[PDB]
Amino acid sequence: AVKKFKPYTPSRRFMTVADFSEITKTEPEKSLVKPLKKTGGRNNQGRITVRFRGGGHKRLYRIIDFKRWDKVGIPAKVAAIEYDPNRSARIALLHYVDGEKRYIIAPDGLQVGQQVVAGPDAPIQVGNALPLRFIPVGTVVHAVELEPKKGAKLARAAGTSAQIQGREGDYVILRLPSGELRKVHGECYATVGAVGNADHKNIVLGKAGRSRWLGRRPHVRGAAMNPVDHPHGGGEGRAPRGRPPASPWGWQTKGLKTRKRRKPSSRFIIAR
Amino acid sequence: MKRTWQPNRRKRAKTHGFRARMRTPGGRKVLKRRRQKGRWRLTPAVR
RNA sequence: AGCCUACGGGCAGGCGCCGAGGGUAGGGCCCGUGACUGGGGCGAAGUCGUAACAAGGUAGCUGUACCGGAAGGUGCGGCUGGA
RNA sequence: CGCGGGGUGGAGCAGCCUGGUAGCUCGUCGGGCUCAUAACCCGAAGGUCGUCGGUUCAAAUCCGGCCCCCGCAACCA
RNA sequence: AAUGUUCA
RNA sequence: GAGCUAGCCCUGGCCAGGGUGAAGCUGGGGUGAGACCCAGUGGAGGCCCGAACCGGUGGGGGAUGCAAACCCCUCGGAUGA
RNA sequence: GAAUGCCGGCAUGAGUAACGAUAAAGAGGGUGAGAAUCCCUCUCGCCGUAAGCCCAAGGGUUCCUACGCAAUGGUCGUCAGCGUAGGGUUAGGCGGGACCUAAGGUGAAGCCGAAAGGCGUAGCCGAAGGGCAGCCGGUUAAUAUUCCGGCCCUUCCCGCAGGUGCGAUGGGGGGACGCUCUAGGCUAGGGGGACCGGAGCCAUGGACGAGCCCGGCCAGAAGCGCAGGGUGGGAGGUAGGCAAAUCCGCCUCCCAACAAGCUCUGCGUGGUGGGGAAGCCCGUACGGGUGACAACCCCCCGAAGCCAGGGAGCCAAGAAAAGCCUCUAAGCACAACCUGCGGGAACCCGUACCGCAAACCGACACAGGUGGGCGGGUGCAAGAGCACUCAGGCGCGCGGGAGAACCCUCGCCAAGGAACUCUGCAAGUUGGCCCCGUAACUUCGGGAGAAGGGGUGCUCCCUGGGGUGAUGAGCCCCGGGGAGCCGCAGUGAACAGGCUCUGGCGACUGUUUACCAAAAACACAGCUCUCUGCGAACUCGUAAGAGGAGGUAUAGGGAGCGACGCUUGCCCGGUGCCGGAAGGUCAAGGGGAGGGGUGCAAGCCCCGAACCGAAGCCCCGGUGAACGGCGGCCGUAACUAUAACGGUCCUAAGGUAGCGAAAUUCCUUGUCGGGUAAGUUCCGACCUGCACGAAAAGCGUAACGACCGGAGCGCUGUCUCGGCGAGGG
């Protein structure tokens, strides 16, 4: 239900806004254990590391429950679907029968007023978390942990999802969103189902102002610089790079792989 | 137009203050040299 | 401010609305013409190739899509106006 | 004017570097196949090597001088 | 495994 | 040495006055149900004209100047990067 | 005797330029030795969303008063922001600190680093932010929300009096938050008034009249009244709020669903306190007295301000901690906490003055720059614009003459209107509001203020809506209709688009070379390639560590192209990148065939070939939205001409689509056609592209542009071709 605008002014006929119908009447956030002061910054102690960062609207970091093994066997009731400006996906407010209030990365199809649980039993239903060794092979899963007892770290973006291909001893083969086949331990929890907000890929920023609102500064091309500032820079009008394309630091940016060859995690990867 | 000197008691006392000099070896050597030379004002006068 | 034959009237005259036409400006239809360009019809004996009619020597035709000096070729699907 | 590459049968290319013998394709001529042409098959002719010289016993081949053709360069104020 | 100028 | 300047961080402030009338709502129309069409309502946008404000397009003057970047006329933006 | 030598002094230009905005001065009197320049008075000119008031930064004696003018003041100066001396800045309520946290800084624990030192959860510091109890008048020459007067508050400490289990830096709530648009009632502010209060006035032809002119408020506890914000109330169970709670949270019933009720603001009213014009008389450098027993009332407009944490829409999703309430634990229930009343205690710093400027920043009394609040009245539709003008403040610290050239700024002009010139550069036309009326084209929004027009003042009469008013008079907004008057001219002055046609480039709003370039350059949404499995890739750092990111392939880094429509062809021979457990080579190392130097000797010391030896290179493949490249010579068609066609050489392949004398074309003002009287420019075509061409993108495209080129219309001193006048020199 992607929202479109009329061409009453330029940069609007193409501007696109995501559908906010899934967001229930819960515009304000929660507290006691919820958004904390988010320290916005574009650099480390001193100089800038990640270039072209800054500006952007002010935000509050919604603390999410990535390690859902803290309340094993305890049910929960989905009471709301909120907006998180720090993530591409939607968050969900949970009210455990136990008494706590934590946010889970709202998966796709998860509606308000639904029971959810995490643990060994944990019936196979959208939103439930189980160890990978318990989930049936061929089911879509998200929020997978890399190593056990380290929190959810894989397939947690808008619309992303992983699939179980098979088991091997204490490890299970997972088809990550990038198509890479990975061996993940069986004790790593993972929330079954997709993530949702698949329309996030169809959104169109429209104008540069929307990019500035998101905190993305105008990226300057290397060819539009000087040789002191970039390897492609310099030369007379529109030089065709005159050399293999490279980054401002020298390393090439066209097919040059940069993964550490001698890595202990190499014997766990099967695909690209 | 706007010139380079825009007085500020706060900035002047924090950037050229006596405590700031003692915090770094550079400022310490600055005070050392000024003492050796016999300066009447080892640090900028701030009221 | 005039003239009158019956004058709380008329005439001449003055002002106003409309008003043919002229001017200004901008649209709509049609007609002629225009360097150049597109394909078309016709034109006894010009060049290149063989597409089709006999399984025309790759069955032919067709809608579409792409490519090719050119007929045309190929892909997808359809037809018997073929076996 | 300058720099470097080429002038070879009728057409297009080698052969030059390391001198002795000029080959490839097309084309032309004669004869085959066809009813006739093309295609194809069998034989053969065809070259003052741009020219003027000199080095050698000897020059397409090596060295000079001119006649053409091809490309590059002709900037600074 | 191509082709057969024009009219009768 | 970032009391100028460039960028970023935290915290505050400012932007007179006019227009254009997007979405959405309500009613009516339409259909088997819709799409959709009319009004009325509604006030969106790096929207429009134009002050404060931020600039610096073209001309003139200034040239041991008012000024080691100025003054006059004109000009761009002016709820947004 | 020279070095554009150094330091100092004095010459020249020279009594020349200038004397710092063209807002403006004139006169009488006084002081004084000396007044254009100091003081007073009268006339005149200027500002007035300021050139007027109030804070903040900065400045530091500049403020007041007395006595002075050698120097500072662009002249004088009796004057001063200058010298000498004296005086002057009063706080529990204003601001900051004995309160809080943010960026950030620091930093016990801890980590890192040759040393210096770097990082770092807790805590600490860290302020126009949070929290927090004062309003109105009088006084000095100089201080006031500080002193005084009135009224009203806040902390503590000690007591009594009544209640409750009190009780923590601990748990919970709360504090607490975006942008835009708005509702109801108020208040600030302002307009009017036949009502009220006033010293006075009849001028010059008329006016004793609802005549003229001035003024008709401020604050104010409880108690009221009017708006408005917050807030559901009980009974059970509970595993969570890192110990425990009656508190919070989660379930299950019963009543509210409402502001009904509790508190909490704002505003009127209120015991009472204060102020009170214009004019005249005075002596000031200025204020005093009277005016006064002042009166202190009624309408209308009305905020951007208040009730505030109000409401609604939207996406980009909008600080923390303390104060505050509540809950319980240690310990203690002789303690303690809440309320009322008494008595008592309440510190440290600033307070003068300038403060859009002569006191700050610019070496200067510099036409420059400098944050926040108030910023009135009338009219022009509106308004912080414009013109004039309250309050208030100035005439800019050299003047007096004259009426040349010439210069700046400004006005007007016969006839012609771009003939000027690189170009209509400049200047001129137009110009606001209301109503008609608007084309090709298009992304259906636009283009559109298209273009081109008409009305615009004043008077009289008739008539329709509202708002405050009781369904009414008035008062304030909006209209409509008909008669008439004047002038050359009715947004009668000031503020206020010239317009169209057609190309190049760029999609567009934006950004940049402060101090010569604002663009076709950069950026931009969007497309594509590539890398990156999370201790990610990349980046800063020797490291620790941090950013990425408290993000996870719809995410993040790099690169190119730059909306959008249609597209983006061939070559992997070379370079790069990617994939290849084969093979060649390949250093340290293993390894010892064999040899050497010394010893009488065991020995010790050297070299040292086979063979095993990674990366890398060679080798084998892929990959162009990777770096790059994408032919030559001949002949041919039944008029010529050209070549659909063929031959041959080479290459890795031999530029297709779409454009083309173009931001690209040397020859070149190529050749035709159009605009013109005439056109090296411009526009449309031809194609012979020296030397376009497909993401250093190609061909187009509505809209957009202080970009660049051409044309036309309207208009004009640009010009023929000058002339006159105004002010500043």
Added chain:
RNA sequence: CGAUGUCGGCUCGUCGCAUCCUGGGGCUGAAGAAGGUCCCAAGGGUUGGGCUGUUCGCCCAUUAAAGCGGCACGCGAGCUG
């Protein structure tokens, strides 16, 4: 080279003659007019536009003529850029 500002235009001229015109003259294949060529002569005059930065040049309408050249390819302490 411890500086001689270099194109073109505007303003201001001035000079040379081997003269565009006007004045005088001689031949002519000069009947006359109108021409051709040559000699003497500069006193004076030698237009306005379109294109281009132009000098130059090509056109438009004329003219008695629409001359050539020097003066730092005259002239920027005169201007334009």
